[PDB]
């Protein structure tokens, strides 16, 4: 407790905790975060109390205390935009796609991860090495997906925050999704 510190890293979807010595440069935490997430260090920007962290700075330098939060930002440089549509769906483009645009009628191919609002992962197509294909705009998937995947471009990564009436509602999903749950997905569009 004297020499080490526990810190929370949030990326807006989930959280991972790290314990490092107070004299250890944050590089070690940043690298551990990047490796666990399968991301390049150079793709990530870290903030503490709104100030950009540099990798050679220590918790001691920044007067950090146990359970302080570091934000990890993977989204495009220049300032994020969370869009709320008329349905109450929210979406945020973490990566802007460069390819073909997804439109209703297409059988599109994606990877996804889904979390509850407390950051617990409930599913991932990547964890089973299994891209997911569906008829976009067909009513075959939950409403937040039909609405939210429309307009993505191939290469894009979009975060959907789906209120339960656009998800599984009061029923939930057996074994997996509670009644009245808000769902967070990161969807990566692979093909249309
Ligand atoms: C024969 C049927 C099996 C068939 C299963 C598959 C092809 C495998 C496929 C990878 C699903 C996953 O299997 C591991 C698993 O994905 C979740 O974990 C998940 O991440 C999720 O939420 N997804 C999946 C990705 C698209 C968004 C959403 C969805 O819309 O999923 C859809 C869904 C469940 C829609 C319901 C349908 C009933 C409506 O009444 C309800 O309306 C509220 C909405 C899925 C894709 C359906 O179109 C097709 C199926 O169900 C669910 C939490 C539970 C689900 O297992 C069942």
UniProtKB/TrEMBL annotation:
- Report any Pfam family annotated for this entry: FKBP_C
- What region holds the PPIase FKBP-type domain? 105-192
Please list the residues that bind Ca(2+) 1.
130-131
| Function according to Swiss-Prot or TrEMBL | PPIases accelerate the folding of proteins.
The residues the record assigns to binding Mg(2+) are: 130-131
Protein's recorded name: Peptidyl-prolyl cis-trans isomerase
Could you tell me which PROSITE patterns the record lists for this protein?
FKBP_PPIASE
* Keywords, ordered alphabetically: Calcium, Isomerase, Metal-binding, Rotamase
Which reactions is this enzyme annotated as catalysing? [protein]-peptidylproline (omega=180) = [protein]-peptidylproline (omega=0)
The record's family statement is:
Belongs to the FKBP-type PPIase family.
Residues that, per the record, bind Ca(2+) 2 = 130-131, 191-192
Q: Report the EC code(s) recorded for this entry.
A: 5.2.1.8
Q: Which InterPro entries match?
A: PPIase_dom_sf, PPIase_FKBP_dom
Instruction: Give the source species.
Output: Burkholderia pseudomallei (strain 1710b)
Instruction: Recall the GO molecular function terms of this protein's record.
Output: metal ion binding; peptidyl-prolyl cis-trans isomerase activity
Identify the SUPFAM superfamilies for this entry. Answer: FKBP-like
């Amino acid at each position: 407790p004297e020499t080490h510190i526990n810190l929370k890293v949030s990326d807006g979807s989930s959280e991972i905790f790290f314990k490092i010595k107070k004299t250890t440069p944050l590089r070690r935490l940043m690298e551990a975060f990047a490796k666990r997430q399968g991301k390049e260090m150079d793709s990530l920007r870290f903030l503490y109390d709104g100030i950009r962290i540099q990798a050679d700075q220590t918790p001691e330098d920044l007067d950090m205390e146990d359970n302080d939060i570091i934000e990890a930002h993977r989204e495009q440089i220049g300032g994020s935009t969370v869009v709320t549509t008329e349905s109450g769906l929210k979406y945020e483009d973490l990566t802007e796609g460069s390819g073909a645009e997804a439109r209703a009628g297409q059988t599109v191919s994606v990877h996804y991860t889904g979390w509850l609002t407390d950051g617990q992962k409930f599913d991932s197509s990547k964890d089973r090495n299994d891209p997911f294909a569906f008829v976009l705009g067909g009513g075959m998937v939950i409403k937040g997906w039909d609405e939210g995947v429309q307009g993505m471009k191939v290469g894009g990564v979009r975060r959907l925050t789906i209120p339960p009436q656009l998800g599984y509602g009061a029923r939930g999903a057996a074994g997996v999704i509670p009644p009245n749950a808000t769902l967070v997905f990161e969807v990566e569009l692979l093909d249309v």
